[PDB]
Amino acid sequence: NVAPKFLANMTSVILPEDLPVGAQAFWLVAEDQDNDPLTYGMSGPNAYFFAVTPKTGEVKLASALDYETLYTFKVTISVSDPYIQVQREMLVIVEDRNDNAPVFQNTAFSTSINETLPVGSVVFSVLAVDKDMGSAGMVVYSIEKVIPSTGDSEHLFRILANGSIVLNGSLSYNNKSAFYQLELKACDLGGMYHNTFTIQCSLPVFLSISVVDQP
Ligand SMILES: [Ca+2]
Ligand SMILES: [Ca+2]
Ligand SMILES: [Ca+2]
Ligand SMILES: [Ca+2]
Predict the structure, then answer these.
(1) Which ligand is nearest to the CA of 130?
(2) How far away, in angstroms, is 23 Cα from ligand 4 center?
(3) Which of 68, 101, 138, 180 is least surrounded by Cβ atoms within 10 Å, i.e. has the fewest?
(4) 193: which strand partners?
(5) CATH for 1-97, options being 2.30.30.60, 3.40.50.850, 2.60.40.60, 1.10.287.3510
């Protein structure tokens, strides 16, 4: 008897982290010089991630993957002819997908500023973080809404790429507004999730700005 032998590409497999439980993950494939019928299996502490169809070598996902928790792992794979069992290690490489949104770190979202604060001043700073890799983890910030809404007020504040909010026009307690509420959003630059290009956005956050009158 000649022992069966896994094909060369059985050393590793790449799988997306969003693969649903129940889906085909990959095929275990081996060859046997005697042309024996071959049966397939998987074992070890990480084998529970999969379910092998022993007759065919089809591998189905049996427990959810997550790049954020276990980005690679090893399993023992097995092929058996009628006479001998042959076992090797396979590396499972999990691919990141865009399954997290930016999350704002800040506890507090209020400040008070003097009405004569010069244009260009930094007024507040926010930070949002996204766990994903690459563009799926790059955060962009936006001012979604300003209250009161004018004409003036839409151009009054600007948020920069590092999360600093700047004063972009002049204030007046008496003649424009004693306050502003800024609705902010953070979004990633997108990536694949559930088989489609996906952009994730935070929950909205609200910054309360009190304007102090100065005579
Ligand atoms: Ca054989
Ligand atoms: Ca994940
Ligand atoms: Ca991810
Ligand atoms: Ca993301």
Answers:
(1) 4
(2) 24
(3) 68
(4) 196
(5) 2.60.40.60
